[PDB]
Structure formats: structure tokens, C-alpha cells
Design a protein around this ligand. Structure first.
Ligand SMILES: [Mg+2]
Ligand SMILES: [Mg+2]
Ligand SMILES: [Mg+2]
Ligand SMILES: [Mg+2]
Ligand SMILES: [Mg+2]
Ligand SMILES: [Mg+2]
Ligand SMILES: [Mg+2]
Ligand SMILES: [Mg+2]
Ligand SMILES: [Mg+2]
Length: 153
RNA sequence: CCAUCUAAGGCUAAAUACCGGCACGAGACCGAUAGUCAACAAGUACCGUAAGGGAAAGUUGAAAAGAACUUUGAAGAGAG
């Protein structure tokens, strides 16, 4: 499969990908943008402590109705959240990428997230029941995610 | 006055008609939202107590040669 961005050199880079993940697209996009260029260990720690609710993911684009929190100051924002499902999905994929690098014989401790991208996957349909005998959709919003790690000093 | 038939009984092929049926041939027609509703397990799924109503849906590749094997993950799912 082809990636949206090609790495500057394929020798010092590893790739990971997932499709039709059953996690919210907007939450996943926000937490992916939160970890756009961190070191691998830093990103792992950040996602872990997001799950334990010690640091927040700032919601910048899809922020309508998102409440304020005190941990967005360190991001220079006002609205932050703690999406643990997307955090753990990204954690699993980061682990997969780390294993990928260790297979390709890359220095694990020098990897940074070069390119991360979240798309919208095909949606799956459910039904909800409203007043006066009416039915509206109950669609979910899965996502496809790709990630590239690159050796930097 | 003329003209023309012989009712109240019966039979009779051909020339004529044919959006059903069997078997065929063709077209300045349509080309999968078109052409029959129906190119496909279509009067099927499904709805209505019933009379009845009634869809959506074609295309890998020349050939499955349909991805052995290694690796991360519980797996989906990935990298080679
Ligand atoms: Mg409002
Ligand atoms: Mg209801
Ligand atoms: Mg009701
Ligand atoms: Mg007579
Ligand atoms: Mg007679
Ligand atoms: Mg007769
Ligand atoms: Mg002829
Ligand atoms: Mg077409
Ligand atoms: Mg097609």
C-alpha cells in the first residue's frame, strides 16, 4: 500500500499503518496532531499519561462544546481532553512501528515521528428510534491511520 | 302498372386477424439511474389480515499465478 508522504530516505525510516480502526476520527486526529513530532519515548510517555489523565490533548479544530481544562495551558490552548481509546490505539500502532524498526535493524532510541495522518474510513450503520415512529441513523466514524518514524539525533 | 328475390331449416375451404404459446431470423433501437419490474439465487428479498404492493444488485486477472515464509500484536490489523 502507498503512503501519502514518502520518507526522505527509506533506509533510516520505518512505517506503520492501520485501517478501519473502530475509534472516533476526530478524537484520533486531535491526539495524532498532539504527537506530531515528538521522540518515540516522549510520545509513548505522553500517551500513557494521557491515559492516566496526567496530560491533556488540546482540541483545536474539532473543539465545539469541548470543556476547558487546566492542562491546556502547557499547550497554549484552553480546551483539552483525555481520549484514552485513541491514545491506546496510537500506542499499539507505535509499538508496531517500534517492532518494525527493530526488525529493520534501526536505532530504536533515536526515532522521531516524521509524518502522521488520520483519514476517515468507510462508515458503518446502526439504527436509533425516535418519537412518532421515526428512525434516524446511528453511524460510527472509524479511521485509517498511517505513521512514519525516522532516525534523528 | 313495372322490376327483383323466395323468409321464418342446414353444411361449406381460400384470400383475412393474432401484444398468449413453440421454434427461429433481423435492427440507422437501449447500453446497467438506460432497455422489460427483472442482464445477477426477480415477481426474489421485503411490506400489508387480505385484495395487493415490490426493489437494490454486472466488470480482479491472459492465466488464481488469490500473496509460501520471517517478524509485532490476543486479534482485527501491519512491516518485510
Ligand atoms: Mg454551542
Ligand atoms: Mg428513542
Ligand atoms: Mg410505534
Ligand atoms: Mg328457403
Ligand atoms: Mg339459408
Ligand atoms: Mg355456419
Ligand atoms: Mg433480412
Ligand atoms: Mg456505469
Ligand atoms: Mg465497478
Amino acid at each position: 500500500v502507498r503512503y501519502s508522504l514518502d520518507p526522505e530516505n527509506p533506509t533510516k525510516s520505518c512505517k506503520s499503518r492501520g485501517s478501519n480502526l473502530r475509534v472516533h476520527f476526530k478524537n484520533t486526529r486531535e491526539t495524532a496532531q498532539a504527537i506530531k513530532g515528538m521522540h518515540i519515548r516522549k510520545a509513548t510517555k505522553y500517551l500513557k499519561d494521557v491515559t492516566l489523565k496526567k496530560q491533556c490533548v488540546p482540541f483545536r479544530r474539532y473543539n465545539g462544546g469541548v470543556g476547558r481544562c487546566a492542562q491546556a495551558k502547557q499547550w497554549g490552548w484552553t480546551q483539552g481532553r483525555w481520549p484514552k481509546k485513541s491514545a491506546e490505539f496510537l500506542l499499539h500502532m507505535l509499538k508496531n512501528a517500534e517492532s518494525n524498526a527493530e526488525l529493520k535493524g534501526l536505532d530504536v532510541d533515536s526515532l522521531v515521528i516524521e509524518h502522521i495522518q488520520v483519514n476517515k474510513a468507510p462508515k458503518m450503520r446502526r439504527r436509533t428510534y425516535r418519537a412518532h415512529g421515526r428512525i434516524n441513523p446511528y453511524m460510527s466514524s472509524p479511521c485509517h491511520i498511517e505513521m512514519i518514524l525516522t532516525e534523528k539525533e
